[PDB]
Amino acid sequence: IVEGSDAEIGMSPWQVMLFRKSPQELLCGASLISDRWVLTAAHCLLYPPWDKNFTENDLLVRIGKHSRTRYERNIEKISMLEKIYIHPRYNWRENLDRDIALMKLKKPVAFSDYIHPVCLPDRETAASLLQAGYKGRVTGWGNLKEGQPSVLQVVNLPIVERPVCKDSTRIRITDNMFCAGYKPDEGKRGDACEGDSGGPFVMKSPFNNRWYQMGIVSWGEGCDRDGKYGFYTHVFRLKKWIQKVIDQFG
């Protein structure tokens, strides 16, 4: 995260850390949606251009963390994966279209003050909140500039209109994506940065007071460049696939 701030303890209880068994290293961000399920960016697991292809045995899921590197004894829970599900039509070849995956934990995790799931949007929550100008919140343990925080960071960014999004890059944008960030104009900054991928973009409903996950950290060209924006997977648009798997697979 570029130009964010340290989160307060218990601020994002659904924030998960994707962690490599060896070398022991942070792979990506992720989010807890139920006691046995984690949501992330498919390119965090599979990306052939960089020879990336993770298997369940290759990783660990670390929940309830605040510090990027200590092992938070008595606070964090470290779990194992039973299965990984990647959207059958994820486009790693051209633009990261449908950049989404589900991971099912080996054993359900227990909730605590620091560990709690986020909600998934319904058609009407999506319709009222996903509007140009409204702000969402991104979190993660990524680079501070295009270097590593000691604690989870946070930033609030406005959603940007589709046209502006498309005129800012040469990549082909689809309905499965949305872009967020300030204008060069707006004179406020911030963005996601390498290591933030697979994390959550959340909003707080003004109707029921709950936090919903609207997007997943997907891609960007540089970090915090003027006239560039961050792109996120559109969670609601892919909701039918999510249902379908949690149904069929426990």
């Binding site: 701030s5 307060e8 303890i9 218990g10 601020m11 209880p13 909730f111 605590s112 003050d113 620091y114 709690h116 799931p117 986020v118 909600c119 909140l129 100008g133 409204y134 702000k135 969402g136 919140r137 946070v154 609030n156 406005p158 909003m203 707080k204 409903s205 003004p206 007071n209 709950r210 936090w211 919903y212």
Partner: peptide
Amino acid sequence: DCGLRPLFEKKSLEDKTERELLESYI
């Protein structure tokens, strides 16, 4: 019980920047 934080909403306490989100939903 989704999206209700044990240290904020369940105690009726606010985080230090959540208002900027709310104030933007016009």
